[PDB]
Write a protein that binds this DNA or RNA. Structure first.
Ligand SMILES: [Zn+2]
Lengths: 59, 85, 136, 192, 126, 49
RNA sequence: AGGUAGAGCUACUGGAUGGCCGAUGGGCCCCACAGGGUUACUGACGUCAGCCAAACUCCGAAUGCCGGUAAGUCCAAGAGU
RNA sequence: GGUUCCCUCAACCUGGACGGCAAUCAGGUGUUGAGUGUAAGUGCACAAGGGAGCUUGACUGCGAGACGGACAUGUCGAGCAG
RNA sequence: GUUACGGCGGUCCAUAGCGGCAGGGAAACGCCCGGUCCCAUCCCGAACCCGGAAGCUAAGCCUGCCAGCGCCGAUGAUACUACCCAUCCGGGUGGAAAAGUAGGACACCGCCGAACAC
């Protein structure tokens, strides 16, 4: 692997709303990201806030 | 028929003959540096004790007698070291 | 009239007229055929006259094959001019014929009409010929 | 098929070449070659009138019984050299055979019958390859065209063969192609 | 049943090495007075020969298969130096001093270079 | 003249030693080449005159 | 050492006859798209059989040419350099 | 251009966002049908074809031996020294 | 000296190639495991390079048998040809193809080195 031409590639972790967690390596210098739909969340992988205001007005 | 026009030929060119060919045949005794074959490409490839010129001309690298052989489908020209009497 | 769609070299030497035919000396498609007996150049204007004489004599039935095609050109230079100053332009197309070569073929149900239909075509060619069949 | 072989007399050639074959043919003989599995070529001479007599009544694949200097040999006619103009027999290749030996032989096919009146019968393949034993080669295989109408193809796979005869040529050759009779407007459009 | 689709990496390596070995042979030839030095580097051992191409016969040949070479506790490069010294002794004992190096289709460097540098240090001139 | 004739002179003794041609549009600047100079007896830089 | 005469081409470059196969299109019905088939068809690709060429060749002589050797003519070719 | 090292094309089939016969990508068949600045011919896949690093021999004094030739011209060349 | 063994070569470089079937891991030849060290990618430890020894003969390699495709190919006959006869035909002496037929063929030879044995 060459020295300078490549960008940074540092460890990171991923936290998702379903309680699932990751620990991988990537180029995100922040070292941690948040994801709102993951493999565990998606309905298609599980076999299955517009509405917030919509229910906050009508009910 | 009785009507006539003007006609001519646009051909009529050629270049000088180059005198290319084999100059020393099999069995001939040659000196060192003697031209053997004149050619364009490598129709004949060099063998043992034979070089190649700038224009693909094969000459003898050592005195001896000319031999014609083949090596993996390539027509080669070789020099054999005739023994001293 | 038959003309090739294209040829590489348009002005060529005269075809040689020596020897007997090396191949194509037997009937392969039809039942009857015409076999040449001497050398000549057969122009495309005599091939078209020969195959119309066959068609008219048999009227409706039967099929006609032509085994020779006018590939080779002959050049004629302009009339009433001296010798030299180039070479003439091609004027007509010929087919080098040698003895033994089969020119035309025909497959017709009967014999008399089929055999007489070929004789009418022979009288249109500048050579001598004969009628041949598939038997030995 | 049971065939009775034909007796012939063969003489060993004293000379060979083109100056000695022309003398042989000018005399009334034909040069011949008797090779075969025995690894034993022989240059012979057969009478021209007699050799052509059996060929006229037994096909090209005749079974010969050559009498070479008093012995008897069984031979098969392999190839014939025929002049294009004079229709001579300039040569004859003969192959030694034995009884019960399977030989690949190319026999001829004859079409017979009268199809639909408005149809034209055309034959494409003149001969087909046939495997049979040395004494059972059919001298002719016939195919019948009767009641056949319009576009129809009697492929080589439908040709009946005598028992004990195999088929070397594959069943894909087109032997007879029967089609509609060409009209007078179709004879003019062809060949122009 | 199973049937591989493409060439293995062993198939590619074997005949691409000989493809660039025969390319090298266009100039390097072995004479009885100036023999030709072959080397066959492998993942395990290394071999050398002293070849004469006019006769098609080899004169001397050292290798790392010998039980004496395996006694060395160094790495593969350390095993290559000893082979580079064994061949020099056997070549000089046969009256050979000048040779020509035939690297065999490998990159000159590492175990290939360590063998040649030890034979140059031990008498052979190339 | 697209490809004019140019002369190369040694940078030490300034002797015209060679003559050649270059494209004056591909290479607009004076050519710089190391050439053997017999007068000096060694290889010296040469420049277009 | 050739590449002429000859021959050969499913061995290259071109020419080119008759069948079979049937993609693609053309035209039509398939109620319009899409959604299956039919033609005396232009019918590619493939294949069976018969061919042609000074500037085509998978091939290929006879002569001719270069060199060596043994003799022949040798009171002559009235020879070669 | 010199030199050292490395590679095999064209065409076809199948799968892919624009993308189509035909752009970039992947796999397979593929022995020369591609390419060689420029006409044609003889060659080149062992590559003379494609890629990369360093460079100027696109030198000086010479040149045994030959090709070809009415002459004047023209062509090849191992090898020695710097 | 023996072996289903490993290198380096050869032959007017396929009679040796393509394909199909069935088999081998003693030492070697390989796949294989990694990227700390020399070294490397116009991106990638895929390749080149280095350090190793868990698994495997599934591939390369090697062995035996098949004539389907390629390759070689007679004898004889013919085409052609040199010289010579021959008043427009043709013939004699010498040479002799291409295609095709019978057939051959799943290579042969040499120098080293391994393990076993002596
Ligand atoms: Zn100077």
């Amino acid at each position: 692997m060459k020295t300078g031409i490549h960008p940074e590639y540092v460890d990171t972790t991923v936290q998702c709303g379903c309680g699932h967690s990751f620990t991988t390596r990537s180029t995100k210098q922040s070292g941690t990201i948040v994801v709102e739909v993951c493999s565990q969340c998606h309905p298609f992988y599980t076999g299955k806030g517009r509405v917030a205001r919509f229910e906050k007005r009508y009910g | 028929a009785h009507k006539k026009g003007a006609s001519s030929s646009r051909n009529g060119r050629d270049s000088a003959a180059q005198r290319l060919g084999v100059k020393r045949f099999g069995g001939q005794v040659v000196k060192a540096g003697e031209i053997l074959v004149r050619q364009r490409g490598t129709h004949f490839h060099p063998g043992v004790n034979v070089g190649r010129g700038g224009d693909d001309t094969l000459f003898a690298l050592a005195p001896g007698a000319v031999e014609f052989g083949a090596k993996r489908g390539r027509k080669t020209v070789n020099i054999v070291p005739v023994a001293r009497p | 009239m038959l003309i090739p769609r294209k040829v590489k070299h348009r002005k060529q030497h005269h075809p040689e007229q020596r020897g007997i035919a090396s191949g194509g000396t037997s009937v392969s498609f039809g039942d009857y055929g015409i076999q040449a007996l001497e050398h000549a150049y057969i122009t495309n204007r005599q091939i078209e006259s020969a195959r119309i004489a066959i068609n008219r004599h048999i009227k409706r039935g039967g099929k006609v094959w032509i085994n020779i095609f006018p590939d080779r050109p002959l050049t004629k230079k302009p009339a009433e001019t001296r010798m030299g100053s180039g070479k003439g332009s091609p004027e007509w197309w010929v087919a080098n014929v040698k003895p033994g070569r089969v020119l035309f073929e025909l497959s017709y149900p009967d014999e008399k009409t089929a055999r007489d239909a070929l004789t009418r075509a022979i009288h249109k060619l500048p050579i001598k010929a004969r009628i041949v069949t598939r038997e030995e | 098929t049971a065939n009775i072989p034909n007796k012939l007399t063969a003489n060993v050639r004293t000379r060979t070449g083109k100056g000695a074959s022309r003398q042989a043919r000018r005399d009334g003989k034909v040069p011949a070659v008797l090779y075969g599995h025995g690894t034993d070529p022989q240059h012979l001479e057969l009478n021209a009138r007699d050799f052509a007599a059996v060929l006229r009544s037994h096909g090209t694949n005749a079974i010969l019984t050559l009498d070479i200097e008093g012995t008897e040999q069984l031979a098969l006619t392999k190839a014939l050299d025929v002049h294009p103009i004079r229709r001579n027999i300039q040569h004859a290749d003969l192959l030694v055979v034995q009884r019960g030996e399977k030989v690949t032989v190319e026999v001829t096919v004859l079409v017979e019958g009268d199809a639909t009146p408005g149809t034209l019968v055309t034959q494409d393949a003149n001969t087909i390859e046939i495997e049979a034993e040395a004494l059972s080669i059919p001298e002719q295989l016939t195919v019948s065209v009767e009641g056949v109408e319009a576009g129809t193809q009697i492929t080589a796979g439908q040709i009946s063969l005598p028992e004990g005869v195999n088929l070397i040529s594959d069943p894909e050759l087109l032997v007879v192609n029967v089609v509609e009779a060409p009209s007078a407007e179709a004879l003019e459009e062809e060949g122009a | 049943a199973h049937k591989p689709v493409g060439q293995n990496i062993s198939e590619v390596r074997r005949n691409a090495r000989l493809r660039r070995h025969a390319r090298l042979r266009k100039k390097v030839a072995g004479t009885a007075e100036v023999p030709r030095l072959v080397v066959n580097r492998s993942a395990r051992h290394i071999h050398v020969q002293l070849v004469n191409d006019l006769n098609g016969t080899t004169l001397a040949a050292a290798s790392s298969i010998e039980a004496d070479v395996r006694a060395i506790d160094g790495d593969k490069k350390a095993h290559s130096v000893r082979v580079g010294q064994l061949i020099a002794e056997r070549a000089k004992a046969a009256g050979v001093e000048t040779v020509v190096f035939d690297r065999g289709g490998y990159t000159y460097g590492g175990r290939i270079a360590a063998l040649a540098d030890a034979a140059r240090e031990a008498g052979l001139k190339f | 003249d697209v490809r004019p004739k140019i002369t190369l002179a040694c940078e030490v003794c300034k002797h015209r030693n060679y003559i050649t041609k270059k494209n004056r549009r591909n290479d607009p600047d004076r050519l710089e080449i190391k050439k053997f100079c017999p007068n000096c007896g060694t290889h010296q830089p040469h420049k277009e005159s």
